């Protein structure tokens, strides 16, 4: 696939539409998320595209290379670690990310996996505690969706 | 990869969970759908995993070999043509299918595409009008979900 899309939904008011486009050896991630509290919110690809138990069944961050959690510019990061999105005072986050590790084809393909936006900021593995190294202390999963193939 | 799952939802009461498992060289489809009217209901893989406009944005039947619509046992069918599921008087349809054209990897992969359950029976391409050769006259899309990777 060259293009993909994800619609984020949850039990609360958070919702959004994320688009993905392969460009060169990168994936361009664009879209918007609404209903968030102003400030930063962790934003990652989780391993499974299983929404049988809401966002909980999506599993942990996508990590085929068995690394610790980090920020997007770090060498030591999960393939799914896309850092944070930032909501404004009206609860709207505009997504504009370029990433070279996620892919829409091959081994690191995220098609069929789940995008999740979280309750708190991702501390990018620099939190000083053990949870920082696993999840970034991003807390709750507010909304998620399975990444599908788009036209 | 080897296992996939889809949660079907829509604007009505129809809901369901469908599991896919690669066994040997084929794909086994199992699960259940509830909230349906008694009788047969078309059940197909549609091309796009795009639920931005509900089930409408899933597009037509997945059809990489550019054939006309048919039943699952026909030579002339779309890869997405899985026939009908049958609901009992209580509105429950048990799904138990084995198909030789869909896959979970490669060119025929359905990961990231959309499973749809329709309002009316699929006539398996034998209705005699142009619409039969496209959709089986299965009608509206009652529920759908994007097919994701499962553990
Ligand atoms: Cu996450
Ligand atoms: Cu259909
Ligand atoms: Zn991570
Ligand atoms: Zn068809």
Curated annotation (Swiss-Prot), chains A, B:
The modification Phosphoserine is found at residues 103, 105. The modification N-acetylalanine is found at residue 1. GO terms for biological process: auditory receptor cell stereocilium organization; embryo implantation; glutathione metabolic process; heart contraction; hydrogen peroxide biosynthetic process; intracellular iron ion homeostasis; locomotory behavior; muscle cell cellular homeostasis. The keyword Oxidoreductase applies. One of its GO terms (cellular component) is neuronal cell body. It holds the Pfam family Sod_Cu. Its cofactor is Cu cation; Zn(2+). It is an enzyme of class 1 (oxidoreductase). Palmitoylation helps nuclear targeting and decreases catalytic activity. It catalyses: 2 superoxide + 2 H(+) = H2O2 + O2. InterPro entries: SOD-like_Cu/Zn_dom_sf, SOD_Cu/Zn_/chaperone, SOD_Cu/Zn_BS, SOD_Cu_Zn_dom. The modification N6-acetyllysine is found at residues 120, 134. Binds 1 copper ion per subunit. Binds 1 zinc ion per subunit. The modification N6-succinyllysine is found at residues 3, 9, 89, 120, 134. Its main location: cytoplasm. It is found in: Cytoplasm; Nucleus. Destroys radicals which are normally produced within the cells and which are toxic to biological systems. Homodimer; non-disulfide-linked. Heterodimer with SOD1. The heterodimer CCS:SOD1 interacts with SLC31A1; this heterotrimer is Cu(1+)-mediated and its maintenance is regulated through SOD1 activation. Belongs to the Cu-Zn superoxide dismutase family. This is Superoxide dismutase [Cu-Zn]. It comes from Bos taurus (Bovine). The lineage of its organism: Eukaryota, Metazoa, Chordata, Craniata, Vertebrata. The gene is SOD1.
